[PDB]
């Protein structure tokens, strides 16, 4: 199921994509730092996960340049997306990182991956999985990680819940830092991400030091029971440049609020 | 030795004492580095190899030594990392026993860390080898023929070589470190998972998020640390310090002096307390007055 | 030469220990893996285990593992199969033969007849 | 584990002939180098042929091991009077070894 | 082979210190009295100039 790509919808970030820079615990202080950050009220791109055809969604799976860092917002109800692919070349010649949301296993592996033209995982485990289809072949390996995947935030707890997971991927000093935060969506709001301040706790650091320059959204797409069906839901991609942020810590140490230094004149005063 | 098996070592908290434990282990030689530092060394992509050796030519197996097995069967680069570990495998390998064939026939010496996996009848002589084995044409492999009677020579000795790869990526193979006990409520110096500091350690009422590991004060000095072994949050306070000031009526009007310990309880730092150690601060019998 | 002289046959009631003694001669007791084999009257042989005198490394047969006790002494170079106590079903022809993980016959002992009856 | 059926149970034939010692195995183990042991009546068994088909030292050439995997056979080309005895097959290189049930030789009844 | 260098030492000596100790370095808990075994090795190693 291949369909011609369309330009992403562009929306303001508002106050989004802010994460704890370090495991330093600070209470009731205002700390300022310069680091890769999503600019506030920055205008960012998004497609739906969509990945369909014939009215049942449309196909979208671009290998976007990884660049400095990737901000990935996911508002999917089910596990429409499962895992990601991060590669400099995305071929069997050069190693690449594969992340999977299947089962209870991150399957975070840096190995040579001859990749299919369209890597689609099984949305539901076929009554088995399309892992052998997302990559044409697996050749050699460097490191493999097994853990609880990031998206165990379940959907069956309550209605109007379309799992909202925000992720920040940054590769510094041969270390791949994955920050993330999942929030109770509660409401549908079929327009964009909420303009609510929230921080992304640092989930995982990966010691593997291979360069990453491109990134493919690894989606889950099981079967038609019309090819395969997964559904449609908005997913956002953004690149965060270094900038100065003044962050507010509460007595719990949580980042309740922060202000970008540069966006508006009133900020530099603050 | 003809076809050895390779291994990759990574994400390893490796202890080398376990190898020291086994008694048949009699070869701890390391051409590269001293075994004393071996456990403390941090490496990555460590590669090991194992094989079957008669043990009479184990000296030839050492890097820089030449032998027919070193010529064909096995190769060790003269520059070496790791250790060559050999233990007497006469218990198992003996019975004779002819499975583990070793190749004594090949066209040329093998390059460092090269595998000669395919056996082709060796054309040592001028006549072509076409027509299987013949005169001046022999099968490369030879039976190792481990008869239990042959004790002095060609007895079953198991040799395994450790090779260390030198920090191409961040090191992932290291030894266990930072292992001592925990104390509290005393002026001590600590290294909390690399956080080196000195001060009195006590339990804290502060609340850390799970990813939070240390906490700093307003002045950005470490004021709380989460223990690595136990998830308890421990508060750090600096060891008691302050200025000392001396009251004197004047040398010529007597020589008695009064010492003021600025900004500290008399209780925390009494005459018991070193800095100015010859000063006994007289004694508690001498009047001790607490002022703001 | 290398011969494994076994103890003589014995007759005894059930419930008592029997350290059947297999003496090995003509070979280094340490250098060779010894072992035991049992035969029911009219049945094929079976493996009971192999003992290494050098380290006393005794690998028992899993089916007979813990059922009986196999041991040996290097100083005299004699196998000492305590056999634990004796069961009425244990009446059998027991050969003590040199064998290892490769399970070679090497030298087979003359065997000892153990009868367990009232 | 591997169960060795020494088919046929008994062989009745004239002296000097050839025979088949079909040691059928539950699983195919040729690397185990299954060993045939010749046991004379009232005698300690003697390993007839080790190394799957390797000739045991001090054994007449009329014996010959053969076969592989799950099916191993021993052919005694010249059945001599002394060859009339019991024959067993036992897994050699495998996990705890198991002997076969046996095989006997006969002429007439 | 006359020239020798010390492969093993308890620790580093002091600025301008001379060490001539010749006793089997003990890297193991078990005391290896005059024994060259695992974790028991005399520190000196011949230069073996070639
Ligand atoms: C974190 O902020 C919350 C603000 O909701 C406060 O937590 C409350 O602390 C009081 C006093 O111990 C408790 O009685 C409440 O049950 C706490 N509520 C919650 C939701 O935890 C407090 O200011 C900070 N500390 C903690 C531990 O919550
Ligand atoms: C191989 O496995 C054996 C299994 O027991 C290890 O033996 C241990 O260490 C010593 C040396 O053999 C024994 O005396 C101990 O009884 C065993 N247990 C413990 C807890 O030490 C042996 O160390 C292993 N060898 C290697 C090289 O790993
Ligand atoms: C690693 O940490 C665990 C706990 O995080 C230690 O477990 C302690 O001892 C028992 C057995 O696990 C537990 O019931 C206790 O609650 C733990 N004590 C504490 C203070 O957490 C475990 O001992 C640690 N590892 C080692 C090798 O000591
Ligand atoms: C975001 O940028 C796009 C161009 O990439 C532009 O067309 C759009 O108007 C911008 N949106 C806002 C809200 O500024
Ligand atoms: C995780 O690993 C693989 C890859 O997903 C999968 O086949 C396996 O069943 C999983 N194991 C567990 C314990 O979830
Ligand atoms: C990352 O890979 C190599 C290995 O370090 C590096 O030299 C190269 O510049 C990077 N690849 C790119 C930028 O495509
Ligand atoms: C202080 O002492 C000096 C020396 O002992 C003496 O000369 C002087 O008179 C003294 N001063 C007073 C005020 O007594």
Residue numbers in the entry:
A (entry chain B): 19 to 145, 148 to 245, 253 to 297
B (entry chain C): 347 to 441, 444 to 621, 625 to 643
C (entry chain H): 1 to 118
D (entry chain L): 1 to 109
E (entry chain A): 446 to 495
Authors' text:
Omicron subvariants harbored a high number of mutations, especially in the spike (S) glycoprotein, and clustered in the receptor-binding domain (RBD) (Supplemental Discussion). Among our recently generated Omicron RBD-directed mAbs (MB.02, MB.08, PC.03),3 all have strong binding activity against Omicron BA.1, while one of these mAbs, MB.02, maintains high activity against BA.2. MB.02 mainly contacted a flexible loop region at the left shoulder region of the spike, and no overlap with the ACE2-binding interface. All six CDRs of MB.02 involve in RBD interactions.
We then determined the cryo-EM structures of MB. Fab in complex with Omicron BA.1 spike trimer at ~3.2 Å resolution. Two major S trimer conformation states were detected, one with one RBD up (72%) and the other with two RBDs up (28%), indicating that MB.02 bound to up or down conformation of RBD regardless of neighboring RBD conformation. In both conformations, the S trimer was bound with three Fabs, one per RBD, suggesting binding of MB. Fab is more flexible, especially in up conformation. MB.02 binding interface contained two key residues (K440 and S446), with K440 contacting CDRH1 and CDRH2 of MB.02, and S446 interacting with CDRL2 loop, indicating MB.02 has distinct binding epitopes to interact with spike compared with clinically authorized SARS-CoV-2 mAbs. MB.02 could bind to RBD regardless of the bound and neighboring RBD conformations. To confirm the structural result and evaluate possible antibody evasion, we performed a neutralization assay with K440A/S446A/V486A Omicron BA.1 pseudovirus. The result demonstrated that triple-alanine BA.1 mutant could result in strong resistance to CoV2-0213, indicating the above residues are key epitopes of CoV2-0213, consistent with our structural findings.
